[PDB]
Amino acid sequence: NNPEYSSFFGVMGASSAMVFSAMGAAYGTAKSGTGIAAMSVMRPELIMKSIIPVVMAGIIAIYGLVVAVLIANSLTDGITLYRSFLQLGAGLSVGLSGLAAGFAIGIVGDAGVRGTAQQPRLFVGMILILIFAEVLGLYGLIVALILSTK
Amino acid sequence: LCCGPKLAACGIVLSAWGVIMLIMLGIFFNVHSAVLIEDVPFTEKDFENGPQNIYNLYEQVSYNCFIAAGLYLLLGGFSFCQVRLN
Amino acid sequence: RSEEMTLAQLFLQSEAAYCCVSELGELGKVQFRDLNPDVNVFQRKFVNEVRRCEEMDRKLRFVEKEIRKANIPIMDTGENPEVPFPRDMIDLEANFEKIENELKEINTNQEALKRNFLELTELKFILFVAGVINRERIPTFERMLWRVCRGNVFLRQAEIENPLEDPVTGDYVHKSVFIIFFQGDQLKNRVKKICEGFRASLYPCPETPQERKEMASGVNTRIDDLQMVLNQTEDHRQRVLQAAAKNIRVWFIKVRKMKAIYHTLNLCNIDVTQKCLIAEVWCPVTDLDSIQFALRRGTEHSGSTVPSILNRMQTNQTPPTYNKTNKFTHGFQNIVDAYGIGTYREINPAPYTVITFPFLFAVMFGDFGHGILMTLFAVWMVLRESRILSQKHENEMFSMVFSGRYIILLMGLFSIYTGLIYNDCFSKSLNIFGSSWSVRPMFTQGNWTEETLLGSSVLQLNPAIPGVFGGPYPFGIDPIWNIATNKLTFLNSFKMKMSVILGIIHMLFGVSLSLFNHIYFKKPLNIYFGFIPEIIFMSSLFGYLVILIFYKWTAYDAHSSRNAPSLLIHFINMFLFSYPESGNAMLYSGQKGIQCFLIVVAMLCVPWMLLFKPLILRHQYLRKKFDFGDTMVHQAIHTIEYCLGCISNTASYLRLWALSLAHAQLSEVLWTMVIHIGLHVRSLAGGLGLFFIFAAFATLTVAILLIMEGLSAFLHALRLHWVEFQNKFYTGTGFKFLPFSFE
Amino acid sequence: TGLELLYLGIFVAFWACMVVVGICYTIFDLGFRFDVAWFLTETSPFMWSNLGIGLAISLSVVGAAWGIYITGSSIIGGGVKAPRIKTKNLVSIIFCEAVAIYGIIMAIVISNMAEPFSATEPKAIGHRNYHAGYSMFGAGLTVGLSNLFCGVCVGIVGSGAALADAQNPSLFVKILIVEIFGSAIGLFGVIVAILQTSRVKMG
Amino acid sequence: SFFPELYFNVDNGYLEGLVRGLKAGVLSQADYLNLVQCETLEDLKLHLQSTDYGNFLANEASPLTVSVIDDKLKEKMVVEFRHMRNHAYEPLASFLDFITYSYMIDNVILLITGTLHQRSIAELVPKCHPLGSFEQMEAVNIAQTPAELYNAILVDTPLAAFFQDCISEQDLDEMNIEIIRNTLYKAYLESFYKFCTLLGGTTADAMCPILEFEADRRAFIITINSFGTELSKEDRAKLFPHCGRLYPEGLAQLARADDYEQVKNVADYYPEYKLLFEGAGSNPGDKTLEDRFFEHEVKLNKLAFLNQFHFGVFYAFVKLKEQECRNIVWIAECIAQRHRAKIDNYIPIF
């Protein structure tokens, strides 16, 4: 019947959904913190104002968690290679979309905090670009669902 | 005075939301017996005998919508009292 | 036409023109323009007054800063002042000069504080030289001591926990004391060069042995302490003078007012012949009589007793725009202007957006309980309008949310309905119990009995159409999907088709408006050979997809599941012109001719816009007798941009599906991970746990979905309302009004 | 050179070992065990197919992220002293995300034709299955890499345009042409991928 | 896919935009024509308000003097540069450090030559450039021998690296300080050139010509200045930079020079130097060699601003704006002397 290697690949997919995506979020948060430092001394009133990038990093983590739980419930002993490779593909794609989005948000958040530290009118502008970062993560997640059926 | 409303109004809104949704959950678990579409989880493993067990245990599970909401019934009353303390 | 006529000229010289413009700017319905010759800022007929106003403004800014240093607030309850026109203002500023004159005396006596600090150092000298140095410079100091002396001297330090006032800046900067011991006079000489680089000039040079010196220093220190305690009375008079800051804040307000008046008079006309100083103004036609009223107010004060009237004058230039906004539509126009500033005589997109933004948010917010929550939020904010507006707030998030309360309320109300048709309220389906799917003897009639025995470990999809079932649902989406393990496939198909169809229709609505403006501006060349090819191209390409998708939805019955076609394969086939004879069946009879004709006419549409119009422009230019190459370059760039861009916009419409799917999945997981555990076996202590469980669940959904992801969805709606909507007809090249309303 | 020395070392060692083993096999008359057929056949096509499916959006999203950040840093840096350019330069990020849109639609197209089989020996899997797997994997790789480089290119040109636009506000209308000429290759990759995966009939 | 352009912005995008915005603050010819018509210093301030320089004279300068104008201009310089520095990571940080080393050396030699005359001890602080301030700016007043000066500079001031093994002397007279200046500047130019060529990429391509020109400029200046003085020729040969295009004839022809004729006969061999020396004919009505050198310098910096991801848009920028300050000062000087005869001697920029 099916080989015994088959259970390997699928499980590995789950690991990716909780490694790569997570790592991206981590970078984002770190970078944003540095920005806050450069902005804390001169414009002290806007510390909480800059709560917006850090949460917008953590959301990437959330996405990873979602898919991980799903691929922890579709795993059974008797899995054919077809299902295993579907699940591996989903995990890889979501992890990498999370990673790329994380890098983008981190850089944009540094630039945003630094820009607002000297120009209040820039605030809204930075927010706009930040959205274009976060949405990228969602695109990865999309195919995950498409790969839980076909 | 003690426990000024500035840090407790969110508590009152949360308590109101909790009590209303818990009453709703209990009512739709008891009267409608929580039809399986609105409820996957149950409490047994051997259900090869008949329907009396399923509805009986559904009533037992809905009964648990009591202290749950009752807990707030009170917490809301306490938080309103703290709000009154000016 | 957002306006008829603004650019006019309705001024004349008067002996007291200042009050004329004061009343005109109180009225706040003008915007001046003049100074075409560009005579420089540094030679103006009204320069000296502007200069002296600048001087007074800097000086009162100085006193304002100084009183702010003393932490004395300002009473901002005063009413709007009245313009003090006459030259006597300057003399009154001389009175105000007196104020700051005594202020200067205070700063002189602040140097007296030096002496206080002086004695204070000797206090810590109760502990061959010693001195007081900055704390933060200890390490470089002691390294320098290592370099110069090589350890032959020794140092020991101490520090005072209280921070020490600064004689010069007043800061509580850290300070410290150091004692250095030597062995000879050469060190006593050489060390002062290093010590003076670290600001220590208050030394009790050795006079007597330790005991007698200690007693003498103690005695003198207490005497001088009593002296400074006596002489510190200057603070009382300083506070007495400082308390008089509040009086002339309204004077500062009117100072700014008449400074701005004189600034406008600087721009005003340069000619002074026959007492004619006419400066051109922008003021909309509907307010013309209002301007006349201001004129009368001028004659209430200006004793020239002249009519001060003048006729309007047309213009060959471009006037600005204006958007009269009522209470309810303020935020929507804020958004639309944030995209850009529309040219004169443009279709204001407010009435469309004001309703298409909640609709789109609902298209990406398909959930009903969260609709109720957002609506409760919005009603809470709205009902306290009078209280909040009459309140002092500080949080900027609260200010922007209170500015967008209208949009928030509308999208909450629409979210409720769209969630209801979604049939996904808090991850469950509101089941009205009208399912008509499976009844037992019907399933046993279709050769299916007691297969659950093997089914205890498998799932057993049922093939549809046993011949006794079906039934759509009037109430939106049939509820049974909410537990079906294959719900994802049908939900995703439905969202795909939903999103594409809505996007195409909304885009058609967007593009269909430009023809109105084209006929309005009377530009025949830009409509006959303009919008017509654009619309025929778009329709022939994508209305075909719409008709095909409805055809597949309506016609292919369940019994023909096999042999059913794939729409995307058909679209790609016609795009590539490949014509396989087998592997996919034609959608309907006569496909070949119609499909071929539509694609060829779509292709033949491009050369019109690509080539024809500039030839006609050159034809008429030559008939008269204009770089023709430039004209076709710009046109061709526009046409290829339109084609590629329209393909990109039609492709970019899937964000609707994306966000809807993310919402669905997130709601399911948020339900089923944390508070799903609330269903348990406990008899007495179960609801106890459910209390905290639901507390955590409610807070987490508040912090994951209600706030931040909703913001992302809202900005995506905004982006769609900007780029793929307004890049079809909205040129966006104009200027708003910068009224002379005083502030 | 700070840490890329490790990468260069791994690369050189790997290729040197590859040359050594290749020549060792060749001169030993032992080439019958270097059966490329065994490697290409006994590996189930599903692994290639799902690798292609993943890559087709992996690379597109990577390119899009690169473009957005490289343009974003410059636009916001320039806007600090020129707020008027803040909104005008959205078009660069629009074009940057267009490649992600193209990538995901390609993933949807490729994802079809995924019918599982039950064959276990190559003769049973068959020519049609092997061709389908290889072709769709290749199409995925092509669209991924093309979209990646299109994204990088448009990001760079958008950065240059945004930097230049802050100076003279009458320059933006004469620099989008390079942007469109960049997006052309991003579309070209998509259409070649379709041309490759046209005739897949896995089963 | 060029070598240096993919990774530049990731940590240097914000500052690049800030500096490029600030480069718009240089005044074109039209503003200079405008500003040459001022009637008094107050007129000059009124015009200065309308330009990007606006609002830095809101003080109590009722008796306005050129001193306050110069001080405020330099204050704007140092505050702007310090803010730019305080937001940079390590590579850009070493770069901006390397920039400020020049002013640091200038300030050190200004202070030592001031204290060489005992008439001034501590009133020399306000003259020194605030930019070139390090923690031991006052140790210079304890050095009786240059060895002691080294011992003062050694610890924290990195200038030690530029003269740690190039100075060996025990007596501190007024002649050798010029040698100190020349050697320190020589080491600074050499180190900066090596750092630039190490940094690699477009920065080297876009900054090598500037440093080369500076090297040759200083070489020629030190040659011409030492004609009729006590400096021996071998020591002069021991003072030229070795990063210019005058490498062979710098050590084989300039050292064998004794009057302006031979310097002309060596400079005319190259095209650009021939043109520069012909333009500066040393006539009574013609500008001296220094003005032509400044003109070429500004031309090179202006040309250097046509590359997107080149670090020196910072360094170049600073130099350029410094020249601008000088220009403004000259104009104000005429307004102090009440004559416009030489008001056109400015050197336009952009």
Going by the DSSP 8-state scheme, the letter that residue D198 receives in this structure is: T
CB pairs under 8 A between A and E: 10
CA E259 – CA E241 distance, rounded (Å): 21
Which residue do the tokens 């009353």 mark? B77
D149 vs D96: CA distance, rounded Å: 11
Scanning every residue of chain E, which has its alpha carbon at the shortest distance from the alpha carbon of D66?
A: E6
Chain E residues close to A38, C-beta within 8 Å: 86-87
> CB distance from C647 to chain E under 8 Å?
no
- Judge contact between E65 and E57, C-beta under 8 A: no
Set of chain C residues whose Cβ sits within 8 Å of the Cβ of B39: 679
| DSSP symbol at C125 | T
Which value, in Å, is the radius of gyration of the alpha carbons in chain C?
41
- Which residue of C339, C583, C651 is in closest CB contact with D102? C651
Instruction: Please enumerate in sequence order all residues whose Cβ is within 8 A of that of C310, keeping only pairs 6 or more positions apart, or say none.
Output: C9, C10, C11, C12, C278
Q: Do residues E272 and E258 touch, judged by C-beta distance below 8 A?
A: no
Tokens of C317: 């230039």
Q: Which residues contact E51 (CB under 8 A, 6 or more apart)?
A: E25, E27, E31
* Secondary structure (3-state) at C586: coil
- How close C360 comes to chain D (CA, Å)? 19
Q: Please tell me the distance from the alpha carbon of residue C301 to that of residue C290, in angstroms, as a whole number.
A: 18
**Rounded to whole angstroms, what are the CA distances from E106 to E112, E290, E291, E297?**
10, 19, 21, 19
Mutate to test the interface with E, among C39, C41, C42, C191 (most CBs of E within 10 A): C42
Distance CA C289, CA C302 (A): 20
Q: Are D96 and D64 in contact (CB under 8 A)?
A: yes
User: Any idea what DSSP says for residue C32?
Assistant: E
- Angle at the Cα of E276 from the Cα atoms of E272 and E278, rounded to 5 degrees: 115
Say how far apart CA C99 and CA C241 lie, in whole Å.
Answer: 8
Q: How many Cα atoms within 13 Å fall on the side-chain side of residue A127? A: 20
Question: How many domains, chain A?
Answer: 1
**Alpha-carbon span E246 to C303, nearest angstrom:** 80
CB contact under 8 A, E136 and C147: no
Question: E strands, C442-556, where?
Answer: none
E229 vs E248: CA distance, rounded Å: 25
C33, β-bridge pairs: C280
C41 touches chain E (CB under 8 A): yes
| Cβ-defined contact of E1 to D77 (cutoff 8 Å) | no
Strand partners, C154: C181
Residues of chain A with Cβ-Cβ distance to C655 below 8 Å are 135
What is the C-alpha separation between A130 and A53, in angstroms, rounded? 8
**Host domain of residue B57:** 1-86
CA atoms lying within 13 Å on the CB side of residue C710: 21
As a whole number of angstroms, the distance between CA E176 and CA C666 comes to 78
CA dihedral C100, C105, C110, C113 (to 10 degrees): -160
| Contact call for A and B: 3+ CB–CB distances under 8 Å | no
Please tell me which chains touch E, using 3 or more CB pairs under 8 Å as the contact test. A, C, D
Nearest to B29 by CA among B67, B1, B56: B56
Query: DSSP letter string over C161-222?
Result: SS-EE-TTT--EE--EEEEEE-SSHHHHHHHHHHHGGG---------S-HHHHHHHHHHHHH
Cβ pair C178, C156 in contact under 8 A? yes
CA–CA distance, C738 with D14 (Å, rounded to integer)? 69
Neighbours of C632 (CB within 10 A): 17
The per-residue DSSP string of B16-54 comes to HHHHHHHHHHHHHHHTS---TTT----S-S---S-HHHH
Nearest to C45 by CA among C55, C35, C54: C35
The count of C-alpha atoms lying within 13 angstroms of the C-alpha of D58, restricted to the half-sphere facing its C-beta, is 19
Distance in Å, alpha carbon of A111 to nearest chain E alpha carbon: 6
- In terms of Cβ atoms closer than 10 Å to its own Cβ (0-12, 13-18, 19+), residue E146 is buried
Yes or no: say if D164 and E14 are a contact pair by the CB < 8 Å rule: no
The whole-angstrom separation of Cα C169 and Cα C77 is: 33
Q: Extract the tokens encoding C152.
A: 């032959």
Asked if C58 reaches chain E (Cβ–Cβ under 8 Å), the answer is yes
Q: Is A114 on the interface with E (CB under 8 A)?
A: yes
CA distance C255 to chain E (A): 17
Residue among E265, E270, E263 nearest E221 (CA): E263
Single out the residue of D104, D91, D186, E257 nearest to residue C658, CA to CA. Answer: D104
Residue ranges of alpha helices (H) inside E86-141 are: 90-116
Contact D68, D96 (CB under 8 A): yes
Asked if E87 has any chain A CB less than 8 Å from its own CB, the reply is yes
Three-state DSSP state, E106: helix
| For B36, nearest residue in chain C (alpha carbons) | C483
Q: Give resolution in angstroms.
A: 3.8
| Cβ <8 Å between C691 and B71 | yes
Could you tell me which residues are beta bridge partners of residue A116?
none
Give yes or no for E7 touching D (CB within 8 A).
no
Q: CA-CA distance, A22 to C442, in Å (whole number)?
A: 51
Three-state DSSP state, C281:
strand
- C-alpha radius of gyration, chain E, whole number: 22
Listed by number, the residues of chain E in 288-317 with a beta carbon closer than 8 Å to a beta carbon of chain D are: 308
Asked if the Cβ–Cβ distance from C572 to D105 is below 8 Å, we say no
Give buried/exposed letters for C149-163 (b at 16+ CB in 10 A, else e): beeebeeeeeebeee
Is the CB of residue B73 less than 8 Å away from at least one CB of chain C? no
Local structure of C702: helix, strand or coil? helix
Rounded to whole angstroms, how far apart are CA atoms C352 and C364? 18
CB atoms within 10 A of CB A145: 21
Tokens representing C392 are 């002092």
First-residue to last-residue Cα distance in chain B: 5
Instruction: Provide the 8-state DSSP code for C528.
Output: I
- Could you tell me if C664 lies within 8 Å of chain A, comparing CB atoms? no
Which residues make Cβ contacts (< 8 Å) with residue B27, sequence separation at least 6?
A: B65
Helices (H), A3-51: 6-17, 20-40
Shortest Cα–Cα distance, E58 to chain C (Å): 6
Tokens of A55: 């949460």
Instruction: Please give the backbone phi and psi of residue C398, each rounded to the nearest 5 degrees, phi first.
Output: -65, -35
User: Which residues are paired to E96 by β-bridges?
Assistant: none
Q: Which of E27, E44, E62, E135 to mutate to test the interface with C (most CBs of C within 10 A)?
A: E135
| Residue C455 near residue C485, CB atoms below 8 Å | no
D122/chain C closest Cα distance in angstroms:
25
List chain A residues with CB under 8 Å of C666: 66
* Contacting residues for C37 by C-beta, under 8 A, at least 6 apart: C270
Under 8 Å between Cβ of E312 and E304: yes
The answer to whether C193 contacts E141, with C-beta atoms less than 8 Å apart, is yes
Amino acid identity at E325: C
User: In DSSP terms, which residues pair with C425 in a beta bridge?
Assistant: C428
Using a CB-CB distance cutoff of 8 angstroms, which residues of chain E are in contact with residue A107?
Answer: 10, 13
Place of tokens 């202020």: C103
- List the chains bordering chain B where 3 or more Cβ pairs fall under 8 Å: C
Task: Give the closest residue to C12 by CA, choosing from C269, C284, C282, C258.
Answer: C269
Q: Which chain C residues touch B14 with a CB distance below 8 Å?
A: 695, 698-699
Nearest C-alpha in C relative to B41: C679
Q: Are B61 and B43 in contact (CB under 8 A)?
A: yes
Instruction: Tell me whether C674 touches chain B (CB under 8 Å).
Output: no
Chain E residue with minimum CA distance to D155 = E6
Please, which residues have CB within 8 angstroms of residue D114's CB and are 6 or more apart in sequence?
A150, D49, D202
CB A146 within 8 Å of CB D56: no
- How distant is the alpha carbon of residue C202 from its chain centre? 56
Separation between Cα atoms, residue E150 and residue E136, nearest integer Å: 12
Dist CA B57 CA E14 (whole Å): 64
How far is residue E177's CA from residue E144's CA, in Å, rounded to a whole number?
13
List the single residue in E with minimal CA-CA distance to C57. Answer: E58
Contact E14 A38 (CB under 8 A): no
- Name the residue of chain A whose CA is nearest to C487's CA: A149
User: Residues with Cβ < 8 Å from E33, sequence gap 6 or more?
Assistant: none
In this complex, the residue of C338, C641, C651 whose CB is nearest that of residue D180 is C641
Q: Give φ, ψ of C180 to 5 degrees.
A: -120, 135
* DSSP assignment string, C613-646: HHHHHHHHHHHH---HHHHHHHHHHHHHHHHHHH
Please report the sign of the dihedral spanned by the C-alpha atoms of residue C219, residue C220, residue C225, residue C227: positive
In chain E, which residues have their Cβ closer than 8 Å to the Cβ of D182?
none
CA–CA separation, D139 and C545 (whole Å): 25
Residue type present at position A126: M
CA distance B8 to B82: 8
* Beta-carbon separation of C568 and D109 below 8 A: yes
Domain span at residue A128 reads: 1-150
